Curated annotation (Swiss-Prot), chains C, D:
Record carries keyword Oxidoreductase: no
Modification type N6-butyryllysine: residues: K8, K21, K54, K56, K68
Phosphoserine PTM sites in chain numbering: S24
Main location: nucleus
Chain positions with N6-(2-hydroxyisobutyryl)lysine modification: K8, K21, K36, K54, K56, K68
Boundaries of the shown chain within the full protein: 25 to 102 of 103
Glycyl lysine isopeptide (Lys-Gly) (interchain with G-Cter in ubiquitin) crosslink, residue number(s): K68
GO annotations of cellular component type: nucleosome; nucleus
Superkingdom per UniProt: Eukaryota
Family in the record: Belongs to the histone H4 family.
One BP term from GO: nucleosome assembly
Entry protein name: Histone H4
From Swiss-Prot, chain E:
Post-translational modification: Following DNA double-strand breaks (DSBs), it is ubiquitinated through 'Lys-63' linkage of ubiquitin moieties, leading to the recruitment of repair proteins to sites of DNA damage. H2AK119Ub and ionizing radiation-induced 'Lys-63'-linked ubiquitination are distinct events.
N6-glutaryllysine: modified positions: K81
Cross-link Glycyl lysine isopeptide (Lys-Gly) (interchain with G-Cter in ubiquitin), where in sequence: K1
Keyword Oxidoreductase among record annotations: no
Coiled-coil residue windows: none
Keywords linked to the UniProt accession: Acetylation, Chromosome, DNA-binding, Hydroxylation, Isopeptide bond, Methylation, Nucleosome core, Nucleus, Phosphoprotein, Ubl conjugation
Family under the similarity heading: Belongs to the histone H2A family.
Protein known as: Histone H2A type 1
Species: Xenopus laevis (African clawed frog)
Listed GO CC annotations: nucleosome; nucleus
List of residues that carry N6-(2-hydroxyisobutyryl)lysine: K22, K60, K61, K81
From Swiss-Prot, chain F:
Included range, full protein: 1452 to 1715 of 2564
Domain of life: Eukaryota
Binding, Zn(2+) 3: C180, C227, C229, C234
Entry binding sites for S-adenosyl-L-methionine: K109, G110, W111, H152, Y153, Y154, N177, H178, Q225, F228
Protein name: Histone-lysine N-methyltransferase SETD2
Family, similarity comment: Belongs to the class V-like SAM-binding methyltransferase superfamily. Histone-lysine methyltransferase family. SET2 subfamily.
Outcome recorded upon mutating D2N: In ALL; uncertain significance; somatic mutation
Description of its domains: The low charge region mediates the transcriptional activation activity. The catalytic SET domain binds histone H3. It is also able to bind oncogenic histone H3 K36M/I found in a number of cancer types, in which histone H3 'Lys-36' is replaced by a Met or an Ile residue. When binding the oncogenic variant histone H3 K36M/I, the SET domain undergoes dramatic conformational change to accommodate the histone H3 peptide, leading to sequester and inhibit SETD2 activity and block global H3K36 methylation.
Every AWS domain range: 43-97
Effect of Y153A: Increased methyltransferase activity
Binding site for Zn(2+) 1: C48, C50, C65, C69
Binding-site positions, Zn(2+) 2: C65, C78, C82, C88
Curated annotation (Swiss-Prot), chain G:
GO cellular component labels: nucleosome; nucleus
Keywords: Acetylation, Chromosome, DNA-binding, Glycoprotein, Isopeptide bond, Nucleosome core, Nucleus, Phosphoprotein, Ubl conjugation
Originating organism: Xenopus laevis
Glycosylation: residue positions: S78
Parent-protein residues present: 36 to 124 of 126
Name under which the protein is recorded: Histone H2B 1.1
Post-translational modification summary for this protein: Monoubiquitination of Lys-86 by BRE1 gives a specific tag for epigenetic transcriptional activation and is also prerequisite for histone H3 'Lys-4' and 'Lys-79' methylation. GlcNAcylation at Ser-78 promotes monoubiquitination of Lys-86. It fluctuates in response to extracellular glucose, and associates with transcribed genes.
Major localisation: nucleus
One example GO MF annotation: protein heterodimerization activity
Disulfide bond entries: none
Superkingdom assignment: Eukaryota
The protein's assembly and partners: The nucleosome is a histone octamer containing two molecules each of H2A, H2B, H3 and H4 assembled in one H3-H4 heterotetramer and two H2A-H2B heterodimers. The octamer wraps approximately 147 bp of DNA.
Family: Belongs to the histone H2B family.
Statement: the UniProt record of this protein carries the keyword DNA-binding: yes
Amino acid sequence: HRYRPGTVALREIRRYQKSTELLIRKLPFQRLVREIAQFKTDLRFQSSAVMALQEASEAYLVALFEDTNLCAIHAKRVTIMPKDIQLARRIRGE
Amino acid sequence: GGVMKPHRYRPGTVALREIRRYQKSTELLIRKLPFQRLVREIAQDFKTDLRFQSSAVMALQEASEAYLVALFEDTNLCAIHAKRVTIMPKDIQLARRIRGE
Amino acid sequence: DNIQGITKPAIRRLARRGGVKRISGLIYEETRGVLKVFLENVIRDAVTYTEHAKRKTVTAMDVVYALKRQGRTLYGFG
Amino acid sequence: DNIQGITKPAIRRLARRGGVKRISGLIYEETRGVLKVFLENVIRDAVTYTEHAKRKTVTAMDVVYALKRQGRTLYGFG
Amino acid sequence: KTRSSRAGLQFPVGRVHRLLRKGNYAERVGAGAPVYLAAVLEYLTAEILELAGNAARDNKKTRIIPRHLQLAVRNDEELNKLLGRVTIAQGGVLPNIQSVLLP
Amino acid sequence: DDFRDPQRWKECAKQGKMPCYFDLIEENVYLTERKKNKSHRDIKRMQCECTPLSKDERAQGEIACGEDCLNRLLMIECSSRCPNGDYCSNRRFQRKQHADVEVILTEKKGWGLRAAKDLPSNTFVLEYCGEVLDHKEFKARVKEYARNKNIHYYFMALKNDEIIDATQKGNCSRFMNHSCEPNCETQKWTVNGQLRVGFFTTKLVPSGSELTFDYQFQRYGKEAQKCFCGSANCRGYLGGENRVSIRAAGGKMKKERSRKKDSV
Amino acid sequence: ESYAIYVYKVLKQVHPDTGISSKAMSIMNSFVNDVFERIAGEASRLAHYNKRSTITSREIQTAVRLLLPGELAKHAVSEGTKAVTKYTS
């Protein structure tokens, strides 16, 4: 048995728009932050700081992908493409 | 025996010529008295019997022209992304939606 | 109806300055509404400032403050 | 090289929450770069606040202020 | 003698001092703040005027005009970032045409 | 065969071998020119955006202001303030860079031109030069001249109110004929703020082939004329069948907002 | 009162034989006022998070570093430091 291409995609869309959990894994995110925070050598962090960075980052990425999807639909496409992200970030003012 | 006319510009040529002509200059593009009348009319809805300053209307005109120019600058990118030359109201609406208006 | 005073060739002129080659037939009616909304917002804020300042004349500094409130700083009319 | 730790399933899940049905194979290298730029900006601001505060430890209030500086205004961390 | 002469600047330190003490920013001000801020303002003013003067010489003119200020600001990488949300009156735009419209 | 000499000679009218019965002409002349134009207020200068090198020619050397210039694409020739200076190639109406032309007899329809050597597309040939008329004089001189029983009328409408006469004085572009298979054409270039009419080629014209341009068909009186080329569909007639009026032929004047009387 | 004469004094040092129009003078006045307001407001913010009474050169420097871009901020800080050094020495 197979579900037809796109059906499980919609299923995931529904379930992940219903849930509220975080999607990115904490240890890789932490290693990334503590790598790119090397600005000032030998830093220390509160956990709530990284907890806030992850929230802000995931919110920003979701808000960017929404406009990416809008651009892709405007182009009469289903598949999103990097040119859509570039257009979104060009109109957004970045 | 008749008077023959030379030729007709290919379409879009004079359009681009105008694009350069109006990108080179720095002036007011909107009819000033109609703009003034419009502002007075839409201001009558908030407080009866007002009075205006000339610079107070000039600043409004400058801001409006800048806003519209920016809107069209983004809309042209939208239309090009749509692989079209002609510019459409759906392009305008997309520009405002993505900008956040 | 003074919104019709913003002429078709005037809007074409603005598009030419913006870099548009070919204009559809509804852009004008869309632009009139956009401009109307923008001007309504700015004028509302300006008249609010004036009525707070107890003036009857609407100064240019009120327009500048309203534009700063909207987030569009304007140099020249200070 | 910890930017490769933001896995393809992670980005796919974020897109699913965003409402995307079909994803190109080139979205991920772009998403990683955008995330890197955003994090670099925010972390730079946070570290600046910390260095001004004469602290070794980067607090959460520093991150909140850094986001407020750019216009994000995160709630829930004080 | 004027504090500006001691500091070697051109913008007036004392007026900046008064504006800081007058604009309701804090309870106290340290002696070095107005000098520092005046130096910063003088540097930014000099940068803007330098680029404006270059833009003015590039068009065979001897008087700086708002169009020249517009070109100077918008033809720079960082000043555009600093003044991205600022509209200059009688400034105009940058001449550019997209490459998919030229024949 | 052309043999331009200033001494008037013994050839009556056909101008095939002796060109000195009428007078020749340089860049055209005006009659009622006033200072009401877009010359030096907004078209003061339209400078191209080019960053050249200009120190490497004849070896890894690209010609300056080719088909990537902002002015050539929009049919504008550069001024003397070009960053290339005296190496720009747009100024073709000012340096008088022309093509090799010759006037002999080809068909009994009249005189014309045939190409001397090979000539590529988008190449300039000749500038249409004559005498610039004005609003009132056209509709009088034409009815004064129709009663003189002339075959050739050298009238070309520049604008809706300007008609250039190339009868009393004309350059070598006055002999070019009409055909329904055009290989050359006319373009409206803007030089020094003033509008000029030029002739460009469209294809690879072989050495010894015809060079004509298409008429935008027009008739002016009750009679009709017909063409003698007959390439593959030739419309038969100069001016077609449809009749148009004195004003439509010239372009009807931009009416001075006086009165109604003038229309009646 | 305004900053016009001082703008002239600055202009005559980087371009001797040039002039400037009144509209450009007004634009420069607005630019100076705007930057002054931005930096002062940012410093006033910085002085509140640490619960301190006094805005100091350190506070202004922090605001400058936060507000200006990379290559511009370094030169701004250098100039301010040189001036505040010459103020006491």
